[PDB]
Design an enzyme around this catalytic site. Sequence first.
Site, PDB file in Angstrom:
ATOM      1  N   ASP A 131     -43.306 -30.361 -31.228  1.00 59.36           N
ATOM      2  CA  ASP A 131     -43.361 -29.349 -32.280  1.00 59.36           C
ATOM      3  C   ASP A 131     -42.774 -28.024 -31.788  1.00 59.36           C
ATOM      4  O   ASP A 131     -43.398 -26.966 -31.878  1.00 59.36           O
ATOM      5  CB  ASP A 131     -44.789 -29.184 -32.801  1.00 59.36           C
ATOM      6  N   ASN A 136     -44.601 -21.718 -32.445  1.00 60.49           N
ATOM      7  CA  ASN A 136     -45.317 -22.347 -31.339  1.00 60.49           C
ATOM      8  C   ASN A 136     -44.829 -21.866 -29.982  1.00 60.49           C
ATOM      9  O   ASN A 136     -45.149 -22.477 -28.955  1.00 60.49           O
ATOM     10  CB  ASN A 136     -45.212 -23.871 -31.437  1.00 60.49           C
ATOM     11  N   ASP A 149     -49.254 -25.321 -28.943  1.00 62.73           N
ATOM     12  CA  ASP A 149     -49.383 -26.261 -30.053  1.00 62.73           C
ATOM     13  C   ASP A 149     -48.445 -27.460 -29.986  1.00 62.73           C
ATOM     14  O   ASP A 149     -47.443 -27.505 -30.705  1.00 62.73           O
ATOM     15  CB  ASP A 149     -49.158 -25.532 -31.374  1.00 62.73           C
TER      16      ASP A 149
HETATM   17  C1  LIG Z   1     -51.583 -14.285 -30.570  1.00 61.35           C
HETATM   18  N1  LIG Z   1     -51.838 -14.826 -29.252  1.00 61.35           N
HETATM   19  C2  LIG Z   1     -52.244 -16.084 -29.043  1.00 61.35           C
HETATM   20  N2  LIG Z   1     -52.464 -16.440 -27.768  1.00 61.35           N
HETATM   21  C3  LIG Z   1     -52.845 -17.705 -27.569  1.00 61.35           C
HETATM   22  C4  LIG Z   1     -53.007 -18.626 -28.608  1.00 61.35           C
HETATM   23  C5  LIG Z   1     -53.373 -20.004 -28.480  1.00 61.35           C
HETATM   24  C6  LIG Z   1     -53.505 -20.816 -29.552  1.00 61.35           C
HETATM   25  C7  LIG Z   1     -53.903 -22.240 -29.422  1.00 61.35           C
HETATM   26  C8  LIG Z   1     -53.021 -23.196 -28.929  1.00 61.35           C
HETATM   27  C9  LIG Z   1     -53.420 -24.509 -28.847  1.00 61.35           C
HETATM   28  F1  LIG Z   1     -52.540 -25.406 -28.339  1.00 61.35           F
HETATM   29  C10 LIG Z   1     -54.678 -24.955 -29.245  1.00 61.35           C
HETATM   30  C11 LIG Z   1     -55.122 -26.374 -29.216  1.00 61.35           C
HETATM   31  C12 LIG Z   1     -55.238 -27.080 -28.025  1.00 61.35           C
HETATM   32  C13 LIG Z   1     -55.679 -28.389 -28.069  1.00 61.35           C
HETATM   33  C14 LIG Z   1     -55.994 -28.957 -29.288  1.00 61.35           C
HETATM   34  C15 LIG Z   1     -55.859 -28.196 -30.445  1.00 61.35           C
HETATM   35  C16 LIG Z   1     -56.211 -28.752 -31.791  1.00 61.35           C
HETATM   36  N3  LIG Z   1     -55.425 -26.920 -30.414  1.00 61.35           N
HETATM   37  C17 LIG Z   1     -55.555 -23.983 -29.724  1.00 61.35           C
HETATM   38  C18 LIG Z   1     -55.156 -22.673 -29.801  1.00 61.35           C
HETATM   39  F2  LIG Z   1     -56.035 -21.757 -30.267  1.00 61.35           F
HETATM   40  C19 LIG Z   1     -53.315 -20.277 -30.898  1.00 61.35           C
HETATM   41  O1  LIG Z   1     -53.505 -20.921 -31.920  1.00 61.35           O
HETATM   42  N4  LIG Z   1     -52.923 -18.953 -31.000  1.00 61.35           N
HETATM   43  C20 LIG Z   1     -52.693 -18.439 -32.358  1.00 61.35           C
HETATM   44  C21 LIG Z   1     -51.240 -18.540 -32.786  1.00 61.35           C
HETATM   45  C22 LIG Z   1     -50.810 -19.986 -33.003  1.00 61.35           C
HETATM   46  C23 LIG Z   1     -49.318 -20.133 -33.194  1.00 61.35           C
HETATM   47  N5  LIG Z   1     -48.942 -21.531 -33.474  1.00 61.35           N
HETATM   48  C24 LIG Z   1     -52.763 -18.120 -29.902  1.00 61.35           C
HETATM   49  N6  LIG Z   1     -52.381 -16.860 -30.132  1.00 61.35           N
END
Ligand SMILES: CNc1ncc2cc(-c3cc(F)c(-c4cccc(C)n4)cc3F)c(=O)n(CCCCN)c2n1
EC number: 2.7.11.1
Length: 267
Positions: A131, A136, A149
């Site tokens: 992805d 991401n 992600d």
């Molecule tokens: C603004 N700074 C910032 N810093 C760090 C993060 C991390 C993540 C993040 C990433 C992930 F891989 C998983 C994850 C891991 C394993 C399984 C699953 C279901 N989810 C969870 C998460 F919270 C996130 O969403 N944001 C929001 C923006 C998303 C953009 N796409 C972040 N935003």
Amino acid sequence: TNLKADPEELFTKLEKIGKGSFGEVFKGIDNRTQKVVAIKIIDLEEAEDEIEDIQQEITVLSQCDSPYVTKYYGSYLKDTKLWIIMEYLGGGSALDLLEPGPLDETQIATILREILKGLDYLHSEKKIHRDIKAANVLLSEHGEVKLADFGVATPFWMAPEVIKQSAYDSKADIWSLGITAIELARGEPPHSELHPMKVLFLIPKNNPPTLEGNYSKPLKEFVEACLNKEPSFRPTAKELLKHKFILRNAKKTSYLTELIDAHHHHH
Ligand SMILES: CNc1ncc2cc(-c3cc(F)c(-c4cccc(C)n4)cc3F)c(=O)n(CCCCN)c2n1
């Protein structure tokens, strides 16, 4: 997944910072270190059909150890809710950083180079990101660029062989990188105006997109290299790291703090 520890004692949950796959994401504080974390909270009764995909993404992230991949700190189950603790990246996503105006080719080349370093790591580990898109790609407050992600093993970034449900490999990420290059240059992927169901048949049907506009020939050629319908004709991440567009235009990642500042002043 830690089952005894109470994540509500271990972390302070602050404001919402995004909506990812399967739940909402919050800024949080690790109460022992005072470091900022990203916290995704998923209600496992409402997201029951997707639990195996969640587990799979956790497993993959837990196996990564790279400066170019967002770190996973652990997960906790309290009542019905799964807390997933990730590295917090205060620069936001590359998609966010497109809001104040167009990127220049040095910014594009720098971001693409760091994405390529992440893909080189993953592909060397026999992993596929699945992805790759500007939403991401996350930046630290220092300009470091990291992948977030992973996709599960919206169509605009998908390679044609992925849509046709053909057996695909890491070259699908190279196609997605080419779409992401267009998105960093133009603000949106190809076909962004169209209904997703139309895009679903246009990607396999049409010739691959090209980058249109007054962009350098090396950037257009970088895009063209990634966006070949034939996966074996797409270069590897290792090879793209030596592409003339990257070598002639990419600079220190610390310069990307100017991009982050521009987003701060725009709001
Ligand atoms: C603004 N700074 C910032 N810093 C760090 C993060 C991390 C993540 C993040 C990433 C992930 F891989 C998983 C994850 C891991 C394993 C399984 C699953 C279901 N989810 C969870 C998460 F919270 C996130 O969403 N944001 C929001 C923006 C998303 C953009 N796409 C972040 N935003």
